[PDB]
Amino acid sequence: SIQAEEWYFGKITRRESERLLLNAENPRGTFLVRESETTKGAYCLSVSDFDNAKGLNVKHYKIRKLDSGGFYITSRTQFNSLQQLVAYYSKHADGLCHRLTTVCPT
Ligand SMILES: CC(=O)N[C@@H](Cc1ccc(CC(=O)O)c(C(=O)O)c1)C(=O)N[C@H]1CCCCN(Cc2ccc(-c3ccccc3)cc2)C1=O
C-alpha cells in the first residue's frame, strides 16, 4: 500500500508541497508523492531542484495509474507499482530535474 510509504504525503496541496520542498537544507531530488489537486485517481511527484539560474526550486510531475495496472509519468516507461516507479526514478534522472534522492522533511 502506498499510504504506508513514508514518501506518500497523500492529500496536501501543491503550495504546501512547495513550502516543504523550498527548504534551503534540501539537496536536489528531495521529493514526495501526493494526490493531484485536479485529477481524481492521479498523483503528483513533487521534486526539489537547484541550479545557478533558478536557485532552489520545485517541479511537479503527474503520475498516471491505469485501471490496467501500470503507473507512469511517461506512457513509454511504466511500472507495476508506485514503489517501483519511485525506485526506478531514484536511479535514472531520464526526463526529471534530478533523480529522486531523499524524502522531504515535514
Ligand atoms: C503548472 C505545473 O507545474 N504543471 C506541471 C505538470 C502538473 C503537475 C501536477 C499537477 C497537479 C497538482 O499540482 O496538484 C498538474 C495539474 O493537473 O494541473 C500539472 C508541469 O508542467 N511540470 C513539468 C515538469 C518539468 C518538465 C516539463 N514537463 C513536461 C515533461 C517532460 C518530460 C517528462 C519526463 C519525466 C520522466 C521521464 C521522462 C519524461 C515529464 C514531464 C512538465 O510536465
UniProtKB/Swiss-Prot annotation:
This protein's source sits in the domain of life called Eukaryota
Query: Where does the record place the SH2 domain?
Result: 7-104
In-chain residues carrying the UniProt-annotated modification Phosphotyrosine: 43
**Tissue spec:** Expressed ubiquitously. Expressed in the skin (at protein level). Platelets, neurons and osteoclasts express 5-fold to 200-fold higher levels than most other tissues.
Protein name, per record: Proto-oncogene tyrosine-protein kinase Src
Disease entry from the Swiss-Prot or TrEMBL record? SRC kinase activity has been shown to be increased in several tumor tissues and tumor cell lines such as colon carcinoma cells.
In its miscellaneous comment, the UniProt entry states: May be involved in blister formation in Pemphigus vulgaris, phosphorylated-SRC is abundant at blister sites but not in normally adherent tissue, which corresponds with loss and disruption of CDH1 in cells adjacent to blisters. Phosphorylated SRC is increasingly abundant at pre-lesional sites of blister formation and occurs prior to changes in abundance of CDH1 and DSG3.
Q: What is known of its domains?
A: The SH2 and SH3 domains are important for the intramolecular and intermolecular interactions that regulate catalytic activity, localization, and substrate recruitment.
Gene from which the chain derives: SRC
* PTM: The phosphorylated form is termed pp60c-src.
